[PDB]
Amino acid sequence: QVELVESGGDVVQPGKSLRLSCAASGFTFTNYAMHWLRQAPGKGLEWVAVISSDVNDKYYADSVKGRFTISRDNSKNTLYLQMNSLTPEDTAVYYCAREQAVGTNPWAFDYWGQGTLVTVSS
Amino acid sequence: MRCVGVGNRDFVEGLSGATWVDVVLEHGGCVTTMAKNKPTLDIELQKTEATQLATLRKLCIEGKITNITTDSRCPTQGEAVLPEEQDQNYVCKHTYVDRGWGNGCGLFGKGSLVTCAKFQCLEPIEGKVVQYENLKYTVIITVHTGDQHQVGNETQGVTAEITPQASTTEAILPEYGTLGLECSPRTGLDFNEMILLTMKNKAWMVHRQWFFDLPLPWASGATTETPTWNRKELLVTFKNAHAKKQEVVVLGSQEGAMHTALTGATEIQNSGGTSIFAGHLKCRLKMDKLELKGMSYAMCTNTFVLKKEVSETQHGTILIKVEYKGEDAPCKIPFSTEDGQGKAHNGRLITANPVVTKKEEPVNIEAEPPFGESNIVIGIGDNALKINWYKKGSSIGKMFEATARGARRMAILGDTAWDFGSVGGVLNSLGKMVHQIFGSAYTALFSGVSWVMKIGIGVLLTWIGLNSKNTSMSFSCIAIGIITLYLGAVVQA
Amino acid sequence: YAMCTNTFVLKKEVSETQHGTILIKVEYKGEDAPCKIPFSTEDGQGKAHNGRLITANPVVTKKEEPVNIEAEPPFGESNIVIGIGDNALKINWYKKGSS
Amino acid sequence: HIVMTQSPLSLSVTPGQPASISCKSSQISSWGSDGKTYLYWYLQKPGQSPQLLIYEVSSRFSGVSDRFSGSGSGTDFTLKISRVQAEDVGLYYCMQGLHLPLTFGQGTRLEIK
Amino acid sequence: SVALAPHVGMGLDTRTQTWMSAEGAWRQVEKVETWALRHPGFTILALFLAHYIGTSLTQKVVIFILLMLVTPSMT
Amino acid sequence: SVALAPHVGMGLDTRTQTWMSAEGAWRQVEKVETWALRHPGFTILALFLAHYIGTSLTQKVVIFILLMLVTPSMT
Ligand SMILES: *[C@@H]1O[C@H](CO)[C@@H](O[C@@H]2O[C@H](CO)[C@@H](O[C@@H]3O[C@H](CO[C@@H]4O[C@H](CO)[C@@H](O)[C@H](O)[C@@H]4O)[C@@H](O)[C@H](O[C@H]4O[C@H](CO)[C@@H](O)[C@H](O)[C@@H]4O)[C@@H]3O)[C@H](O)[C@H]2NC(C)=O)[C@H](O)[C@H]1NC(C)=O
Ligand SMILES: *[C@@H]1O[C@H](CO)[C@@H](O[C@@H]2O[C@H](CO)[C@@H](O)[C@H](O)[C@H]2NC(C)=O)[C@H](O)[C@H]1NC(C)=O
Numbered sequence: 001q002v003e004l005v006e007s008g009g010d011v012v013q014p015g016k017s018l019r020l021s022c023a024a025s026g027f028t029f030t031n032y033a034m035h036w037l038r039q040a041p042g043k044g045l046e047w048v049a050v051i052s053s054d055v056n057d058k059y060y061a062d063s064v065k066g067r068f069t070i071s072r073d074n075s076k077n078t079l080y081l082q083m084n085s086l087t088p089e090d091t092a093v094y095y096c097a098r099e100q101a102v103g104t105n106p107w108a109f110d111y112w113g114q115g116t117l118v119t120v121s122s
Numbered sequence: 123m124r125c126v127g128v129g130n131r132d133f134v135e136g137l138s139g140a141t142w143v144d145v146v147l148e149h150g151g152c153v154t155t156m157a158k159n160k161p162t163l164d165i166e167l168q169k170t171e172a173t174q175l176a177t178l179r180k181l182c183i184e185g186k187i188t189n190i191t192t193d194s195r196c197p198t199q200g201e202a203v204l205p206e207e208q209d210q211n212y213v214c215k216h217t218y219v220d221r222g223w224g225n226g227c228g229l230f231g232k233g234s235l236v237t238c239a240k241f242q243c244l245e246p247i248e249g250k251v252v253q254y255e256n257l258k259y260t261v262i263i264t265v266h267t268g269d270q271h272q273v274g275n276e277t278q279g280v281t282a283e284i285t286p287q288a289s290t291t292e293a294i295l296p297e298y299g300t301l302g303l304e305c306s307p308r309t310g311l312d313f314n315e316m317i318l319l320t321m322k323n324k325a326w327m328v329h330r331q332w333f334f335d336l337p338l339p340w341a342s343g344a345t346t347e348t349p350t351w352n353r354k355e356l357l358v359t360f361k362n363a364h365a366k367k368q369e370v371v372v373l374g375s376q377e378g379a380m381h382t383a384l385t386g387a388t389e390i391q392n393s394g395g396t397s398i399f400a401g402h403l404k405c406r407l408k409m410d411k412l413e414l415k416g417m418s419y420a421m422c423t424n425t426f427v428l429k430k431e432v433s434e435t436q437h438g439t440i441l442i443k444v445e446y447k448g449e450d451a452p453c454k455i456p457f458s459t460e461d462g463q464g465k466a467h468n469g470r471l472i473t474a475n476p477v478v479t480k481k482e483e484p485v486n487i488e489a490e491p492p493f494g495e496s497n498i499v500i501g502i503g504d505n506a507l508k509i510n511w512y513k514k515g516s517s518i519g520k521m522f523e524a525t526a527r528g529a530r531r532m533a534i535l536g537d538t539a540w541d542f543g544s545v546g547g548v549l550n551s552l553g554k555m556v557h558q559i560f561g562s563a564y565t566a567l568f569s570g571v572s573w574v575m576k577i578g579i580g581v582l583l584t585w586i587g588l589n590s591k592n593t594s595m596s597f598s599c600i601a602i603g604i605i606t607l608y609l610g611a612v613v614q615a
Numbered sequence: 616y617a618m619c620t621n622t623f624v625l626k627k628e629v630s631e632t633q634h635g636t637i638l639i640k641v642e643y644k645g646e647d648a649p650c651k652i653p654f655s656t657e658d659g660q661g662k663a664h665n666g667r668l669i670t671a672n673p674v675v676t677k678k679e680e681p682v683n684i685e686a687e688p689p690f691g692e693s694n695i696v697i698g699i700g701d702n703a704l705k706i707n708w709y710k711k712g713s714s
Numbered sequence: 715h716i717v718m719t720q721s722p723l724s725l726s727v728t729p730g731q732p733a734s735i736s737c738k739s740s741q742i743s744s745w746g747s748d749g750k751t752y753l754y755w756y757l758q759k760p761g762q763s764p765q766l767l768i769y770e771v772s773s774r775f776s777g778v779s780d781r782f783s784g785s786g787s788g789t790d791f792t793l794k795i796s797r798v799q800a801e802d803v804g805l806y807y808c809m810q811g812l813h814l815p816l817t818f819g820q821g822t823r824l825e826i827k
Numbered sequence: 828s829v830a831l832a833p834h835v836g837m838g839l840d841t842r843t844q845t846w847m848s849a850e851g852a853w854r855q856v857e858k859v860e861t862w863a864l865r866h867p868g869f870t871i872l873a874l875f876l877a878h879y880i881g882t883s884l885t886q887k888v889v890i891f892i893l894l895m896l897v898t899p900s901m902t
Numbered sequence: 903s904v905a906l907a908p909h910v911g912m913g914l915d916t917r918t919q920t921w922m923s924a925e926g927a928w929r930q931v932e933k934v935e936t937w938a939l940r941h942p943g944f945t946i947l948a949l950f951l952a953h954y955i956g957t958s959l960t961q962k963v964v965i966f967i968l969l970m971l972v973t974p975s976m977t
Binding site: 287306 | 625627628660692694704705706707708709
């Protein structure tokens with residue numbers, strides 16, 4: 001019954017900014033610790049970033065450190081991923097995932113969004 | 123004519139010297155009050171909206187357990203300690219365990235281990251109280267005009283919104299004058315002990331004390347990050363695996379359990395604001411500024427022709443739909459019920475005054491005849507339409523149905539049911555007072571007794587009364603047995 | 616002072632003290648000098664007068680400022696009437712208990 | 715960072731036969747405090763967003779056919795598919811979840827022979 | 828759990844149906860009936876206890892009914 | 903199922919601890935206590951019935967206890 005929808009994927013030249021929005025529905029969004037995920041075509045899934053239930057425990061991966069910003073807005077039920085200094089290697093389809101409802105890990109993936117593709121080239 | 127096919131219309135005949143007839147507007151019902159000369163009109167409260175309500179407290183129905191951590195001390199040493207015991211978000215239970223040389227401790231005996239765990243809720247359930255400065259009742263007043271599209275229509279009437287602050291009002295009618303309502307909303311359904319609770323786009327009305335009593339972890343209610351849950355041990359269960367070590371388990375989703383815990387609570391729509399249905403309101407109708415607006419008209423000479431076959435309602439009232447034939451005036455519609463060979467008329471016009479309005483639309487009258495063979499004559503001339511009908515029932519059946527309906531009203535509305543059609547008679551006041559006292563006693567005694575237990579206690583008390591030497595039998599048996607069995611039979615609603 | 620001659624608008628919903636006294640808070644929307652507030656609590660379904668003010672003289676000093684009359688209603692169900700008596704404000708309230 | 719290795723990179727099995735995938739970690743995925751191995755397994759159907767199959771290793775996510783079963787402990791885990799249907803084609807991804815920089819394994823695939 | 832303590836006898840009732848009127852009317856009696864069907868010997872025990880603790884006949888019947896209704900209800 | 907007719911008392915028990923002996927041990931007693939404390943009025947009628955049924959004190963007391971344990975749980 002959970003429904004995750006993406007928005008913001010578009011073509012863009014290198015260096016320019018872009019903000020990705022993950023609208024969620026079917027559950028209380030404010031009591032969860034959302035993730036972001038990506039996969040270049042012909043490659044495996046790659047982790048991107050996590051925002052915890054408390055808004056002040058963000059984390060990012062090594063290859064994307066100091067270049068991306070992840071932020072939640074509880075009231076509007078959307079997940080904002082502000083990405084800067086994008087390069088043609090970073091382009092991929094981006095998946096927005098939910099947390100594990102049943103389990104012990106504070107971080108896991110129950111349900112994956114539909115998925116939006118961002119295209120980066122000159 | 124809005125109050126025609128509902129099946130719960132209950133007529134209110136007559137009014138006092140000051141013309142303040144009274145009605146009790148039941149949510150599913152409608153009154154269709156009338157008078158000697160005033161325009162007969164039907165009233166029905168519809169929605170009783172409430173808004174700008176605040177969240178009181180939040181309960182949790184689904185939990186997640188993270189960061190299970192454990193420490194254990196040797197026997198004859200203090201209880202095991204974690205630095206995480208004193209965090210607001212941790213549930214942690216001490217317990218015992220056996221350990222000797224196998225666990226690296228020299229002294230044999232029972233040791234103490236503790237397993238703290240971090241608890242964060244996933245889907246809270248909010249309980250939101252409704253205030254009294256925002257409750258808004260909404261009442262439609264549809265007047266019987268015999269209009270073409272008035273029978274059964276649910277979109278005709280004049281809204282008269284009535285809030286507790288501005289209790290009184292005067293609903294101005296299109297052409298029939300003004301009708302004033304002195305309604306009293308504070309004595310109706312009590313909204314102080316009733317707290318709304320909402321989950322997953324479902325809203326219910328529950329008793330306030332019951333909502334506090336139910337065993338789920340609650341919180342402050344004011345929205346904020348990380349609401350520190352209280353009494354959170356109700357979800358987490360700490361199984362001990364036959365004294366060797368401890369495991370921590372979260373109980374699971376309580377949505378289905380609550381959906382059973384709310385068995386007798388009413389339901390309300392929660393799409394926009396709170397459209398609280400399932401209420402009741404009492405009000406008195408001033409009904410002194412109304413005008414018949416048809417008295418000055420004449421009587422139509424030309425004939426009348428019907429358009430639909432006569433069909434009576436569930437309350438034994440003939441409904442006639444007739445279109446006026448060619449003429450050049452609006453008028454009064456003549457009407458007289460006649461038997462086959464008897465000219466005595468006992469059939470009244472529940473419609474106040476049937477008047478043709480625009481000469482092109484059929485005006486549908488609505489009048490009840492006496493039971494038995496009795497035809498109806500409408501037009502004034504000898505070529506008048508003669509609709510013939512044979513009413514099925516009898517007066518005794520009507521009396522029995524009236525007694526059953528009154529019993530239902532007194533069983534549902536309780537104390538305030540004695541003021542339903544009150545003309546202001548002194549006897550009704552005495553009846554209401556004695557019923558109020560006995561009803562307070564009955565509520566105090568039987569509060570919380572279930573549907574089957576009421577029947578059980580009623581039959582037990584009936585038997586006790588029957589087999590009694592003292593002359594308390596004729597009181598106990600009749601009164602308590604009848605009252606309790608009836609309430610048990612019709613309590614659940 | 617004279618008698619008030621305009622409608623009163625209730626500003627805050629009526630609440631009851633533990634002892635039974637209603638504490639009304641009316642605001643005066645009318646162009647008139649400071650004057651006495653007419654006050655009569657008709658009882659349930661009757662003209663009888665069984666409720667009395669606990670405030671001796673409920674006068675409005677200024678047009679802008681709202682006054683807050685305290686009065687105890689009849690012990691059952693009643694209808695407090697504040698105003699000129701034709702377009703007066705019928706503040707309704709219901710007391711629960713036994714004498 | 716945990717190096718994740720999947721033994722097969724392509725499996726061709728005829729319907730009605732078992733197909734097993736081995737994913738070997740680089741360090742221990744067992745969380746010492748609770749004694750639970752935190753591994754995960756995802757199936758990405760052709761042209762679809764991946765779903766979840768095996769949270770932890772013994773356990774199994776809801777809405778999942780009973781055929782799938784996780785096995786293994788201590789850096790070497792294994793799935794099993796008792797009967798393979800046409801819908802089991804996809805890209806099974808073993809991922810660790812113990813340490814915060816979650817690393818998937820290289821994508822294996824399963825095609826009908 | 829919370830599945831007990833139904834909002835049954837509060838008394839703030841209206842004309843409309845409650846949450847589960849038809850479904851929740853007979854739940855308790857169905858539970859008692861199925862428990863008695865599952866465990867027959869407790870009927871023998873209740874008969875014995877009522878006979879040896881009930882002086883009159885109505886007392887016997889009442890205490891037997893109370894026992895047979897409480898045991899599945901008690902748990 | 904609904905949290906009625908639990909698994910207790912069926913048998914098939916052993917020394918290893920069962921599912922929820924920690925919490926469900928006193929659940930019914932706590933329910934009866936909270937229902938009695940939330941609806942104190944029924945005690946008067948229970949005493950009335952107990953006094954009008956029974957020619958002794960033993961059956962009086964047992965009928966009182968049986969009603970006080972039937973009504974809340976059978977609720
Ligand atoms: C509850 O249980 C969960 C279970 O995961 C715990 O989650 C921990 O979250 C923290 C994040 O706050 C994780 O910290 C990460 O540790 C990595 C360990 O790396 C090695 O360990 C040493 C010890 O410090 C490190 O110094 C070395 O780097 C070693 O390689 C670490 O690599 C990782 O760094 C990541 O984030 C930084 C900052 O963005 C990046 O610069 C870096 O490149 C990388 O992306 C984190 O620091 C920790 O690992 C998680 N636990 C486990 C078992 O993995 C919770 O802490 C528990 N408690 C609570 C209250 O939730
Ligand atoms: C209820 O009353 C409304 C309004 O009088 C009726 O709607 C009218 O229908 C006629 C014929 O279809 C139109 O010519 C009018 O323009 C409508 N008026 C409106 C929409 O305001 C309606 O038909 C009646 N009956 C029902 C069942 O709704």
